[PDB]
Design a protein around this ligand. Structure first.
Ligand SMILES: *[O-]C1=C(C2=[C][C]=[C][C]=[C]2)[C]=[C][C]=C1C1=NC2=[C]C(C([N])=[N+])=[C][C]=C2[N]1
Ligand SMILES: [Ca+2]
Length: 223
């Protein structure tokens, strides 16, 4: 997260770190046995780490569970990152409490202007690589569709939205992909891509979760 602040230990209890010897993406807990992340964060050997804050120290509250299966959206396009969503099922269920809780899926899409919280252990520099130890947060709004499309002509589909600041300075960055964008207590986005981090007029693009709720629901119901 570039230009964000330290969330404070376990203040984002639905945030998960996907680990394969190190942290490579974030994700969101939506129920006791399922996480939602981004399709390009797919790999085998994923351990989902819950109740974290410093990802390099065991501080207590952590639950480490292995993924039983990951489901990449079938129409995921790696060249356009259209449909960049993935569901990970956990081997056993997580123990929910005040430090590990899930987040509700939206019933309606959010409107431009809506302010949301984006979190993650990603890079904090736009020009360089500095990965933090504890979780970072950034409050950013959803932009209108015309600004998004005017920033990324020909690269935004209806399953994507831009959120951020056009003046630059604040944005999600690498290490944040897969993580959440929660607005009014509903998961409205997943960190998907961007051009650099915190650059001027190049806001971050997020996968539009309101467009996948029936799919998340039906897939989870059948697996
Ligand atoms: O996410 C990502 C990755 C990556 C590839 C494959 C698996 C896991 C991660 C590699 C490089 C960069 C990124 C990435 N860049 C980026 C930029 C923004 C932004 N500027 N808003 C958000 C999220 C990411 N991820
Ligand atoms: Ca830790």
């Amino acid at each position: 997260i570039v230009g964000g602040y330290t969330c404070g230990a376990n203040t984002v209890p639905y945030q998960v770190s996907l680990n394969s010897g190190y942290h490579f993406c974030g994700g969101s807990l939506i129920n006791s046995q399922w996480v939602v992340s981004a399709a390009h964060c797919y790999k085998s050997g994923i351990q989902v780490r819950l109740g974290e804050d410093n990802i390099n120290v065991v501080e207590g509250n952590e639950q480490f569970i292995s993924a039983s299966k990951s489901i990449v959206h079938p129409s995921y396009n790696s060249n356009t990152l259209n449909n960049d969503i993935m569901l990970i099922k956990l081997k056993s269920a997580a123990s929910l409490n005040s430090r590990v809780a899930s987040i509700s899926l939206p019933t309606s899409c959010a409107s431009a202007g809506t302010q949301c919280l984006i979190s993650g252990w990603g890079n904090t520099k736009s020009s360089g690589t500095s990965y933090p130890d504890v979780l970072k947060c950034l409050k950013a709004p959803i932009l209108s569709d015309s600004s998004c499309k005017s920033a990324y002509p020909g690269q935004i589909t209806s399953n994507m939205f831009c959120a951020g600041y056009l003046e630059g300075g604040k944005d999600s960055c690498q290490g944040d992909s897969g993580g959440p964008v929660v607005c009014s207590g509903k998961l409205q986005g997943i960190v998907s891509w961007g051009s650099g981090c915190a650059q001027k007029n190049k806001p971050g693009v997020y996968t539009k979760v309101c467009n996948y709720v029936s799919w998340i629901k039906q897939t989870i119901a059948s697996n």
